[PDB]
Symmetry: D2
Subunit: 117 residues, 4 copies
């Protein structure tokens, strides 16, 4: 398993088991947006990566629809984690909840559904 984008973003896996995964990273200078806070795409990439790993432990799967709800902004240097858990596993689709956490606070909530190939 090699994910070029995860590697480019400096992400690491803290846990991987059937139906679940935790991916972590640190907000670097190149991850900031025009507001000076962690770009929504960086936080989403983090959650999506945990989502991808968790869902693929059940077999090949690709994202269909994902929702990202942002609660708190993060600045450079912030250590963040995306914790993915399985909500539903069906024959051709599956859904996961991914909590994005930093220093014990829920920074964002990701909800995604995949199509099982």
């Amino acid at each position: 398993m090699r994910d070029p984008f995860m590697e480019a973003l400096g992400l690491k896996v803290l846990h991987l088991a059937p139906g679940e995964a935790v991916v972590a990273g640190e907000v670097r200078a190149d991850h900031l947006n025009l507001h000076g806070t962690a770009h929504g795409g960086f936080l989403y990439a983090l959650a999506d990566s945990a989502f991808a790993l968790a869902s693929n432990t059940r077999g090949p799967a690709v994202a269909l629809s994902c929702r990202m709800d942002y609660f708190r902004p993060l600045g450079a240097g912030a250590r963040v984690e995306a914790r993915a858990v399985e909500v539903n596993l069906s024959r051709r689709t599956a859904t996961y909840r991914v909590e994005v956490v930093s220093e014990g606070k829920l920074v964002a909530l990701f909800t995604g559904t995949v199509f099982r190939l």
Copy 2:
């Protein structure tokens, strides 16, 4: 206006006007996922960037909730664009639709709502 993450991803602005924006990029080797296709986070970052620029033409705004629907995978070298248009503009919130297109095909659809500061 300087967005470190957009710059790091090699994104460029093709259009910016009141309530709308178009951001473009090319899928590079470092943008691929474990599947060998454009990482969902890269495509989302592209759409989110157009969303951010379009929404901020109305004044400071931050994302609340965003949905990303994926329709077609993209490989390295693909030229992609995210076209953001305003769907609703309220006093404290606004919503935008962002079409992600590559070679005339709709690759994904992004729907997002911001909170106006």
Copy 3:
């Protein structure tokens, strides 16, 4: 085609063609919520009905994920329509955009994806 819930809500079809549908209704006294405005479930039911009809013109399909963005409240007596159009049609999934309109104003935006049986 008989839909008990659509009938119970007093909904009517104003258009049905391949990949698209328009469903209309009027906000009645029994459709109001604790706020005295059209219940979110009534507006969603309206959009979902147009979504269901439009998607099923392509063959049997059931909803996977749907998003409803609310922009303006409606009171009793308001005439409302849900206009569904096809955004993407794939082999096993399809996505539709449904605009909820009343007196020329966009009251809400519904985005939904179905699984094709």
Copy 4:
């Protein structure tokens, strides 16, 4: 507190406390769709009602964006519940997760964000 639509749908409250609520109902003949299963609008109305009650325990609030993920169909006679819990409470917005359950099975997952008036 009187909600005409909840009453019309035969819904009842099983729990209400700060930041949370449980609403229950039974799928009646008039709640079925063209497929002969519980209409998506009925299940959404159920979840939305729990969402509305839970969010309003914190003060007046109206829905901004809601997502409904469907996992299992329900037939006439099914007893269903929507359990709403608070995910995030901010100054002007709040987010809730609502699990739709029937006979111990997760039938659907609702995720919604409100604007606090």
